[PDB]
Coordinates of C-alpha atoms in Angstrom, one line a residue:
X11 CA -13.2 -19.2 18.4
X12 CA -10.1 -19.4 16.6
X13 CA -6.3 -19.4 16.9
X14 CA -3.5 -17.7 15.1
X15 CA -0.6 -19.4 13.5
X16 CA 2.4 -18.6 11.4
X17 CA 1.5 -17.2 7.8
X18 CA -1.5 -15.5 9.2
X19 CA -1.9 -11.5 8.8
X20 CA -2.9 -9.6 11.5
X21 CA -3.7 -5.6 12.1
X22 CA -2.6 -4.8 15.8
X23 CA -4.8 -2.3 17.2
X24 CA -4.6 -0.2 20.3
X25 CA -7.5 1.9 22.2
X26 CA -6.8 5.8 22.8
X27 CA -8.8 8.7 23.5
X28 CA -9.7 11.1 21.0
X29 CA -12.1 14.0 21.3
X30 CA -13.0 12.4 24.6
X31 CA -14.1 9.0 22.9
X32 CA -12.0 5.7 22.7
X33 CA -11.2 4.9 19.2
X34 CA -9.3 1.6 17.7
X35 CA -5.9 2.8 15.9
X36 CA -3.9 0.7 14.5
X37 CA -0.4 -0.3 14.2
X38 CA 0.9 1.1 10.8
X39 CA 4.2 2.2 8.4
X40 CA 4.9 3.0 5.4
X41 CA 8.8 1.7 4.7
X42 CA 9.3 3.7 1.5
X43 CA 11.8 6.5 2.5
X44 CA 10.2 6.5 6.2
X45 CA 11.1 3.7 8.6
X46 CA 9.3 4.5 11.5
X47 CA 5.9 2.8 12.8
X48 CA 2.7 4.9 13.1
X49 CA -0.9 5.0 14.0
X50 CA -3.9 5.1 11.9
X51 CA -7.4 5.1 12.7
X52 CA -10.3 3.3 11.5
X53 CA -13.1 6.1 12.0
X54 CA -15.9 7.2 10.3
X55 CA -15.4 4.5 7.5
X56 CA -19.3 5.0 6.2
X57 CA -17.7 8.5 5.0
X58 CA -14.1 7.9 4.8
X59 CA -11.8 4.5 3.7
X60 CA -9.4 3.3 5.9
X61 CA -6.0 2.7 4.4
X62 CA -5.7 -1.1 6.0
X63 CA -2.8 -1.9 3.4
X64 CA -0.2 -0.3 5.6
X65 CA -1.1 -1.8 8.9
X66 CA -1.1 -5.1 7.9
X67 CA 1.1 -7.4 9.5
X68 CA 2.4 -11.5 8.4
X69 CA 2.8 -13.7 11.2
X70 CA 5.9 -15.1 10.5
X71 CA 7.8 -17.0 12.7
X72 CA 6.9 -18.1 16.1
X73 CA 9.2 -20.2 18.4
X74 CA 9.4 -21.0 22.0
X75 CA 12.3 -18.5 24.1
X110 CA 2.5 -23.6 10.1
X111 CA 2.6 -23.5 13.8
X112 CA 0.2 -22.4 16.2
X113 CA 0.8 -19.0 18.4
X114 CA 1.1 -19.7 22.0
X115 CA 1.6 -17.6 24.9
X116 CA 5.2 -17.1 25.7
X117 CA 6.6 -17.3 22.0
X118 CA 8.8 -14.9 20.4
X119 CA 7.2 -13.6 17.0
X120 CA 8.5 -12.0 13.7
X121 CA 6.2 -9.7 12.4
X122 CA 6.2 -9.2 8.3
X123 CA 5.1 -5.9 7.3
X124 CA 2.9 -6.7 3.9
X125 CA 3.3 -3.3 2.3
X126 CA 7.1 -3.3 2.7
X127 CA 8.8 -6.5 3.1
X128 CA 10.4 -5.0 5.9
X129 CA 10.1 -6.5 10.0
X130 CA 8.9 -4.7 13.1
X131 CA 11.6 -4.3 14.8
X132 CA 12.9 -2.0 18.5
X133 CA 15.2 0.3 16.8
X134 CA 18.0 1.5 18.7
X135 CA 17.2 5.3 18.2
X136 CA 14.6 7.7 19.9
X142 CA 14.5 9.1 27.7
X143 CA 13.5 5.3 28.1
X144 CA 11.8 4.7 25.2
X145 CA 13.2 3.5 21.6
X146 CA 11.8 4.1 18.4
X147 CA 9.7 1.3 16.9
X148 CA 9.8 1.0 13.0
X149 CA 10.9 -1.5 10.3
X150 CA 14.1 -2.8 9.3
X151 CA 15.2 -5.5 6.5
X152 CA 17.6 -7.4 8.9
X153 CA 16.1 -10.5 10.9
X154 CA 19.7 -11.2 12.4
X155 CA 19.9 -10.1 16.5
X156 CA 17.1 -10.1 18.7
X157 CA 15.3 -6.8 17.5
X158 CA 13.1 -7.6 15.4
X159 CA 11.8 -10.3 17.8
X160 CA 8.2 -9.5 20.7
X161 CA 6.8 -12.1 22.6
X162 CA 3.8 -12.6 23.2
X163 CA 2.5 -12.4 26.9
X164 CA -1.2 -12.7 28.7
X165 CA -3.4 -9.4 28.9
X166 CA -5.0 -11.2 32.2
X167 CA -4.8 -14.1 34.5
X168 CA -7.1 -15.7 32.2
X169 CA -4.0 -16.9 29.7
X170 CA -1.3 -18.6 30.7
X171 CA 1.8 -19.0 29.1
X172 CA 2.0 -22.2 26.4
X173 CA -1.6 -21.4 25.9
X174 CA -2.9 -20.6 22.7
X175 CA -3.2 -17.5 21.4
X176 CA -7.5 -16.6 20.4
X177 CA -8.2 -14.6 18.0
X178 CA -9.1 -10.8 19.8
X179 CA -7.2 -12.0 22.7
X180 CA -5.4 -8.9 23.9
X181 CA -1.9 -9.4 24.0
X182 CA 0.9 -7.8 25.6
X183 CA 4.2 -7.3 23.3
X184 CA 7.6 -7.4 24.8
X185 CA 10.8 -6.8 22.8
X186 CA 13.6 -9.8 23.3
X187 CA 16.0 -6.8 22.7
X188 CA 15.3 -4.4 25.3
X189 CA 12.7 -5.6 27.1
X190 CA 10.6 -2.8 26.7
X191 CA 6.7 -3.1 25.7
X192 CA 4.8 -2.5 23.0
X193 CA 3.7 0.7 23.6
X194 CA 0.8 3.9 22.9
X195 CA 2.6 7.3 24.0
X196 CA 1.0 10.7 23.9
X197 CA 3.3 13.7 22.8
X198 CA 2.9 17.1 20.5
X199 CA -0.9 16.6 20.3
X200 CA -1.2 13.1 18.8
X201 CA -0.5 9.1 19.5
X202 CA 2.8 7.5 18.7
X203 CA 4.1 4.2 19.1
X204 CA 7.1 3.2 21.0
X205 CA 9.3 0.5 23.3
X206 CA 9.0 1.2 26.5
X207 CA 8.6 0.0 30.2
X208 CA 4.7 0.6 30.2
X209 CA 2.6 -1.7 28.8
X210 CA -0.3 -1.3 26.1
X211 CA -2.9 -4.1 25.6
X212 CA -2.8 -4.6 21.9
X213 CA -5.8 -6.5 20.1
X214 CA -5.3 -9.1 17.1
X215 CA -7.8 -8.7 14.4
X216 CA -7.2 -11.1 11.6
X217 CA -6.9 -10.1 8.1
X218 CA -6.4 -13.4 5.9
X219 CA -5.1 -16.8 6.7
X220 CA -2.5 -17.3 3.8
X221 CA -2.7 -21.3 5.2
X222 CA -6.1 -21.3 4.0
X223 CA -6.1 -19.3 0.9
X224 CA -7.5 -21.2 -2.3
X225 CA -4.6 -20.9 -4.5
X226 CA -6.0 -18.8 -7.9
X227 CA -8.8 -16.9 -5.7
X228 CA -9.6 -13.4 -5.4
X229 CA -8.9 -12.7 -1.8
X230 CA -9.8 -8.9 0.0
X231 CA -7.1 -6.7 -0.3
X232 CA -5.5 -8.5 -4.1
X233 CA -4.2 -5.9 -6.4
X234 CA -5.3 -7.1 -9.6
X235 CA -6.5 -5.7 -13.5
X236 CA -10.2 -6.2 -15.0
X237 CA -9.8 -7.6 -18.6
X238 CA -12.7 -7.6 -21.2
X239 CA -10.2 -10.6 -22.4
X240 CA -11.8 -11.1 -25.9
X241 CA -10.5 -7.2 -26.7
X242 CA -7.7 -7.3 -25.1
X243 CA -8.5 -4.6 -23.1
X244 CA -8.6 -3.7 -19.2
X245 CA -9.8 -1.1 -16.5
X246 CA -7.2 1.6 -16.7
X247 CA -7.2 5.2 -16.1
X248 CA -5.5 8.7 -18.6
X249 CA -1.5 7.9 -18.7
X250 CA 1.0 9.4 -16.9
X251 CA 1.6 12.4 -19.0
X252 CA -1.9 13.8 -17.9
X253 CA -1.9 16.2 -14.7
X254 CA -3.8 14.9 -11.4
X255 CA -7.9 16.1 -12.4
X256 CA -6.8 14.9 -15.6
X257 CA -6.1 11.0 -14.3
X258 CA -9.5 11.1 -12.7
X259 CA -11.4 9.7 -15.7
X260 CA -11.8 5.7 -16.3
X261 CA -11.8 3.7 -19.1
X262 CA -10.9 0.8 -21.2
X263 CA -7.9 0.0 -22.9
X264 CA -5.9 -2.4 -25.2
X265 CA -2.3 -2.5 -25.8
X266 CA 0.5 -1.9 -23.4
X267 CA -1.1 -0.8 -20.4
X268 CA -2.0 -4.5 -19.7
X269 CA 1.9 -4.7 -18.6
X270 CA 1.8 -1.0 -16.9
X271 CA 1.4 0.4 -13.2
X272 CA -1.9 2.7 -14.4
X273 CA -4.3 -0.7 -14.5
X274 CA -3.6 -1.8 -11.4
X275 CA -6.3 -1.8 -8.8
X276 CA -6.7 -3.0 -5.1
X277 CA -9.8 -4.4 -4.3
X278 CA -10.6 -3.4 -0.4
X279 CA -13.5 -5.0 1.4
X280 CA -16.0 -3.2 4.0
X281 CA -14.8 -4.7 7.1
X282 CA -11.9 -4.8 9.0
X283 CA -11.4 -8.0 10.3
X284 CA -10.8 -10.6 7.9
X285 CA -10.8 -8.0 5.1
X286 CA -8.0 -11.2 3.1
X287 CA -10.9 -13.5 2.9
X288 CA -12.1 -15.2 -0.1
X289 CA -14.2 -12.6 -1.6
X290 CA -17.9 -13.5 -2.8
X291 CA -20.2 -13.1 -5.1
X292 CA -22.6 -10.2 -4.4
X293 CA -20.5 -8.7 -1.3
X294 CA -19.6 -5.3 -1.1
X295 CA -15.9 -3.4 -2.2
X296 CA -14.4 -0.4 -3.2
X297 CA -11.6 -0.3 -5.7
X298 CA -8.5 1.6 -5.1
X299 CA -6.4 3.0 -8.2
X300 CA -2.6 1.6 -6.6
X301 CA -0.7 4.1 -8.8
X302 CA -2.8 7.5 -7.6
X303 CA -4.1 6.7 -4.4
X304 CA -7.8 7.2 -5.8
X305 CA -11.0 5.3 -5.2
X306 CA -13.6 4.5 -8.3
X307 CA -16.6 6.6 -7.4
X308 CA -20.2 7.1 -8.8
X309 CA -21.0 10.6 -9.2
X312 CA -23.9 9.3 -12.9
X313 CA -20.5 9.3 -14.2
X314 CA -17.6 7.3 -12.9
X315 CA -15.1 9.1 -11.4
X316 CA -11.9 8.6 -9.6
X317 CA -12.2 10.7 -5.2
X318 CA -9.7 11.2 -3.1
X319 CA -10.0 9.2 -0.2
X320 CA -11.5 11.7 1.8
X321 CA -14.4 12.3 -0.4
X322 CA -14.7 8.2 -0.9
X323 CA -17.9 7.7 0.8
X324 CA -19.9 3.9 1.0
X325 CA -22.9 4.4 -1.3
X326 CA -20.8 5.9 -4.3
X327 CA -17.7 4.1 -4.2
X328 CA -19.0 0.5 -3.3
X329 CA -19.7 -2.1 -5.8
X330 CA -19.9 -5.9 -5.7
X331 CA -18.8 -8.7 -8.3
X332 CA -21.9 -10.3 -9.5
X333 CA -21.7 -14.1 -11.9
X334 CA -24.1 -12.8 -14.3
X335 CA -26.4 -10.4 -14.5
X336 CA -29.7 -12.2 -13.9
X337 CA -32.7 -10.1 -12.1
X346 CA -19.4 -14.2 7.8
X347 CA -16.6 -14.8 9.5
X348 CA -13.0 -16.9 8.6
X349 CA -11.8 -17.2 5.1
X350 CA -14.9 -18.0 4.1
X351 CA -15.6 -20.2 0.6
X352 CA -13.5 -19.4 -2.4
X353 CA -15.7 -18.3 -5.2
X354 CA -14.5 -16.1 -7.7
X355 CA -11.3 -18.0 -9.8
X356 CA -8.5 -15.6 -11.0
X357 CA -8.4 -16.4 -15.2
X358 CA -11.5 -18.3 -15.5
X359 CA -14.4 -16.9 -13.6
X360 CA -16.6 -13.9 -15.7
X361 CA -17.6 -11.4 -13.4
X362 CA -19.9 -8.1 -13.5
X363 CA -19.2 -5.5 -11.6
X364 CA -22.1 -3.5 -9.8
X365 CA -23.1 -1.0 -8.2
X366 CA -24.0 -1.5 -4.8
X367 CA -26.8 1.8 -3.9
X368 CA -28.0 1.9 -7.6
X369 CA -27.7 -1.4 -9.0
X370 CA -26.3 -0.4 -12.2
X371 CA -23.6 -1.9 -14.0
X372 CA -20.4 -1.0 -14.9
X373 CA -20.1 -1.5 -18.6
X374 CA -18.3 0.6 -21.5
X375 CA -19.6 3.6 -24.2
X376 CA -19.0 1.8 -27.9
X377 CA -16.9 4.1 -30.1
X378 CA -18.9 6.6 -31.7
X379 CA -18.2 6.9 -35.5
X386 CA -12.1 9.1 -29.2
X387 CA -10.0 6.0 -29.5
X388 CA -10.6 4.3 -26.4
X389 CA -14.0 3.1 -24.6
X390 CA -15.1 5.1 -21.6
X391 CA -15.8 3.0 -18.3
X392 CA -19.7 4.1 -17.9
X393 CA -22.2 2.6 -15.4
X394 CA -26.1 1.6 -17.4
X395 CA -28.8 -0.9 -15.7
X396 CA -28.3 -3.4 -19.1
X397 CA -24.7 -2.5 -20.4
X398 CA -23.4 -5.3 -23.0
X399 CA -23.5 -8.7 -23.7
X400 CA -19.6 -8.8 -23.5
X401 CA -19.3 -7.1 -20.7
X402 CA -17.8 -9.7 -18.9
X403 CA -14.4 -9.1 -17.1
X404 CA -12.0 -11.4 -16.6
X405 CA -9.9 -10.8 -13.7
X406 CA -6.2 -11.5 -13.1
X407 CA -3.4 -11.0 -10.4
X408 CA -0.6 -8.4 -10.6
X409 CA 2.9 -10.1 -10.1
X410 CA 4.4 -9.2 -6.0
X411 CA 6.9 -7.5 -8.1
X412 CA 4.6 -5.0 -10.3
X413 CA 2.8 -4.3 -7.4
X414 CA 5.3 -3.3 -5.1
X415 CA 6.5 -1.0 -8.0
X416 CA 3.7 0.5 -8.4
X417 CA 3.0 1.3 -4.7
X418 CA 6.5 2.6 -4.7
X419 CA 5.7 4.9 -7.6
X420 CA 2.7 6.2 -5.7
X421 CA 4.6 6.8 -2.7
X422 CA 7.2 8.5 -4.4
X423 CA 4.9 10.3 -6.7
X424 CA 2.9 11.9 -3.7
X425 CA 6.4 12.5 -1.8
X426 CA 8.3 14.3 -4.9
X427 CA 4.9 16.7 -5.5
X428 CA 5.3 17.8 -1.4
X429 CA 8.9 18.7 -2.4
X430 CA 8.2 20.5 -5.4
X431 CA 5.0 22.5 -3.8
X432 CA 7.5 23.3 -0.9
X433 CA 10.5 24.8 -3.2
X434 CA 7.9 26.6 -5.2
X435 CA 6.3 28.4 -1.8
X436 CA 10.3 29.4 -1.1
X437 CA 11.0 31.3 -4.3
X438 CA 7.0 33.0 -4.3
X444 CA 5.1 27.6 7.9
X445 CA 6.8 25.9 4.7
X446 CA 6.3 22.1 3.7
X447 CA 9.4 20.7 2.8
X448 CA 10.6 17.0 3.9
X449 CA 14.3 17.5 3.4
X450 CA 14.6 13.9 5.5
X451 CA 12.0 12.0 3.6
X452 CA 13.3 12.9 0.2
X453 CA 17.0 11.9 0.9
X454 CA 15.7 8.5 2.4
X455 CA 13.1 7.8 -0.5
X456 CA 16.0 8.9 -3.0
X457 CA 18.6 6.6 -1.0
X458 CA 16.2 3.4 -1.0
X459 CA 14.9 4.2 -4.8
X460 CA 19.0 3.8 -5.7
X461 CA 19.0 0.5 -3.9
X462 CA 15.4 -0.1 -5.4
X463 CA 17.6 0.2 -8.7
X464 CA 20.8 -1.1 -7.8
X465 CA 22.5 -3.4 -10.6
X466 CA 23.3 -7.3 -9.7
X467 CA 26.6 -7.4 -8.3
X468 CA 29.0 -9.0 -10.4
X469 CA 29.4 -11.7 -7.9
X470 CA 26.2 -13.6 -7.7
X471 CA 24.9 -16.6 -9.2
X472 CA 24.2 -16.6 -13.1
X473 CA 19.7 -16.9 -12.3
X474 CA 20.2 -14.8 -9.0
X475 CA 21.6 -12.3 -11.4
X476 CA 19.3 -12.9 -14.4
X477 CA 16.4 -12.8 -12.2
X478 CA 17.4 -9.6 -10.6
X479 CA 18.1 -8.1 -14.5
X480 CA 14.6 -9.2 -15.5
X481 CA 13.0 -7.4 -12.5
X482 CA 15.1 -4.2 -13.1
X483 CA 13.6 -3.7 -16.7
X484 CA 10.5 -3.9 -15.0
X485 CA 11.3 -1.4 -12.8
X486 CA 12.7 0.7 -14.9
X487 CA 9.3 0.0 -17.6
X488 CA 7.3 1.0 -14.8
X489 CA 8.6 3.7 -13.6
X490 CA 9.3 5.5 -17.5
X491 CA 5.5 5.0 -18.1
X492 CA 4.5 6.8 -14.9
X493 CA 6.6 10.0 -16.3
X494 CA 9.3 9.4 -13.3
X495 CA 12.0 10.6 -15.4
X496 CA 10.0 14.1 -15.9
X497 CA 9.2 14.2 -12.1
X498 CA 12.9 13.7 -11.5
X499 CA 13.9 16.3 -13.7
X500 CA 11.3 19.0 -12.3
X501 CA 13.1 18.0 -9.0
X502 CA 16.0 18.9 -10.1
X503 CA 15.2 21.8 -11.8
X504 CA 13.8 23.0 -8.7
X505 CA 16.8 22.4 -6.9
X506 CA 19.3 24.3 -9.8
X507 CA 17.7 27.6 -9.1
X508 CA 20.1 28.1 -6.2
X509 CA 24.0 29.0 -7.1
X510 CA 24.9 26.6 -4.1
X511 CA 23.9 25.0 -0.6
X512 CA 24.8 27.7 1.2
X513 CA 22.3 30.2 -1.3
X514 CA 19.5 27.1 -0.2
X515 CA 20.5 26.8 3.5
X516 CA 19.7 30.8 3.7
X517 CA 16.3 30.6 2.1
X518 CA 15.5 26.8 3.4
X519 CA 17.5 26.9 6.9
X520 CA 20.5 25.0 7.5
X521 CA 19.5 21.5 7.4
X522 CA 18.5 21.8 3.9
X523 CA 21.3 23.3 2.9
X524 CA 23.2 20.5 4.5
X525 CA 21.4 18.2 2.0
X526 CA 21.4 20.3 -1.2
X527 CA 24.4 18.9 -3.2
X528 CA 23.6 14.8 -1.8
X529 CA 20.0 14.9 -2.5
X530 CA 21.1 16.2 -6.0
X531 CA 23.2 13.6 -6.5
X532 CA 21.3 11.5 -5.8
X533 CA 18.7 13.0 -7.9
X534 CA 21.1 12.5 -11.3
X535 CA 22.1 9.0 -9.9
X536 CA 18.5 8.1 -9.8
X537 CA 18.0 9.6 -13.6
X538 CA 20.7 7.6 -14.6
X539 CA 19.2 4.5 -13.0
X540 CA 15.9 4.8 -15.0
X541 CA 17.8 5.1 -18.6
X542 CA 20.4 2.7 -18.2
X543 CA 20.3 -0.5 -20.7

């Protein structure tokens, strides 16, 4: 029986009805070039990953109207994919929208807390899967599961929803230089200077499917990043152990590492248990909290294995075809020892922006294709994406502090590194390519409709201010 308290991470979760049977959904958003909440589900995960990364919430802040929740308290809740706070936006009869914003000023991005039943009372403690009731300090309104055009939504409004707390990680808890579930991360053979890495970003989609080993750059780059995502649900941040099961997520495609006996990258749709689990193993010899920490970022030599089949993953020597193929063989090598290591917050974020981006930029450019051959095309989400990439890139104003402004400068090479080695630059330019086979907005707004026309010449603009962002020195 445990309690919640500030610096924890949560996943709120809600019951509907689906196909006549109550499901869990959770509370979810994105917050790259889409702001509002949303709802995801946690179904048929035996066959299907859930995509827990987006629903995941940091306890914050919580104050009376790290510190113990109690009943009564006003709560800031940090999305962990964005940055960004849960917040009762002003938009939407008497309802508002619910969705992230950056600002923690005002009362909007501030719920309390408030008994399910008669069995909490207000100063009590909050348990963990205690189902709470969340009330916005700025207009009062609940928490709240709608129904509308054939699917479930999230709002503020004046009917409640019980909401359960299942809890992710304790970040007041977490061994400092762990692996903890959910850690985007690289897998080094340290000795070769080489890690876990995937074709570059030159290479079409079924051609970034294949896995291997790599020295050089790439160590610095977006393509060998990886998310490790446990099983379960709740406390899917604990310290992960030796010998427990995982699948790997590729952060800068979306895909999941997958035994066919090949290796091979699935779309999370085809990602199911027994060919995309695997386990970290301390050599290869024949519960519920945070658990103990047992696998030590820099120092600890892991093997990775194959959960269903045993096997190991291991690498194909060069035949006498630079690089070493990522292969899976019940002995492998002697040296096939990885060492693992944490991705800076920073390359990380970028490289879940990229994805984003990436995945949003390819819906445009299917969608202007169908015009010039019902119709695909998110107008809205490219000129939000395109405005917050600008910010993304935004140069230190001139009036800042000399290391607030250094710092800033460092992180915007980065950015920019990133981005150039993911073939951004090309992807912006087949944009606007795309875009310059119309004489003006009014040619576009009669093929597209009128609200794309409307956004023709900005979202160009912005396309070339962006270009100009990833070339400047």
């Amino acid at each position: 029986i445990q309690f919640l308290r500030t610096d924890d991470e949560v996943v709120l979760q809600c019951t509907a009805t689906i196909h006549k049977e109550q499901q869990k959904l959770c509370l979810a958003a994105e917050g790259f070039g889409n702001r509002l909440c949303f709802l995801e589900s946690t179904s048929n995960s035996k066959n299907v990953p859930p995509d827990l990364s987006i629903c995941t919430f940091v306890l914050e802040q919580s104050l009376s109207v790290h510190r113990t929740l109690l009943y009564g308290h006003a709560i800031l809740l940090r999305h962990s994919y964005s940055g960004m706070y849960l917040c009762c936006l002003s938009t939407s009869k008497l309802a508002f929208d619910v969705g992230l914003q950056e600002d923690t000023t005002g009362e909007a991005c501030w719920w309390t807390i408030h008994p399910a039943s008669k069995q909490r009372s207000e100063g009590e403690k909050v348990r963990v899967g205690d189902d709470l009731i969340l009330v916005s300090v700025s207009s009062e309104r609940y928490l709240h599961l709608s129904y509308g055009n054939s699917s479930w939504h999230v709002d503020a409004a004046f009917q409640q929803t019980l909401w359960s707390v299942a809890p992710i990680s304790s970040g007041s808890e977490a061994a400092q230089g762990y692996l903890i579930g959910g850690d985007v991360l690289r897998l080094l053979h340290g000795h070769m200077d080489e890690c876990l890495t995937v074709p570059s970003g030159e290479h079409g989609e079924e051609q970034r499917r294949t896995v291997h080993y790599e020295g050089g750059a790439v160590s610095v780059h977006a393509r060998s990043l990886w998310r490790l995502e446990t099983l379960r649900v709740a406390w899917s941040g604990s310290h992960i152990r030796w010998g427990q099961p995982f699948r790997l997520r590729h952060v800068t495609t979306g895909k999941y590492l997958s035994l066919m006996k090949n290796l091979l990258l699935m779309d999370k749709e085809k990602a199911d248990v027994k060919s995309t689990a695997f386990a970290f193993r301390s050599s290869k010899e024949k519960v519920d909290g945070m658990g103990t920490s047992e696998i030590k970022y820099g120092d600890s030599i892991c093997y990775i294995q194959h959960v269903d089949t045993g096997l190991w993953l291991t690498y194909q020597a060069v035949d006498v075809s630079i690089q070493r193929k990522a292969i899976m063989h019940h002995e492998g090598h002697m040296d096939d020892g990885l060492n693992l290591s944490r991705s800076q917050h920073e390359e990380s974020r970028t490289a879940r922006v990229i994805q984003s981006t990436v995945f949003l930029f390819n819906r445009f450019i299917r969608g202007l294709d169908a015009l010039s051959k019902t119709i695909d095309l998110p107008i809205e989400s490219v000129s939000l994406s395109l405005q917050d990439l600008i910010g993304y890139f935004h140069p230190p104003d001139e009036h800042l502090e000399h290391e607030d402004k250094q710092n800033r400068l460092r992180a915007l090479k980065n950015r920019q590194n990133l981005f150039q080695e993911e073939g951004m630059i090309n992807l912006v330019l087949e944009c606007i390519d795309r875009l310059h086979v119309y004489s003006s907005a009014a040619h576009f707004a009669d093929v597209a409709g009128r609200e794309a026309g409307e956004s023709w010449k900005s979202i160009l603009n912005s396309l070339y201010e962006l270009l100009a962002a990833l070339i400047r020195g």
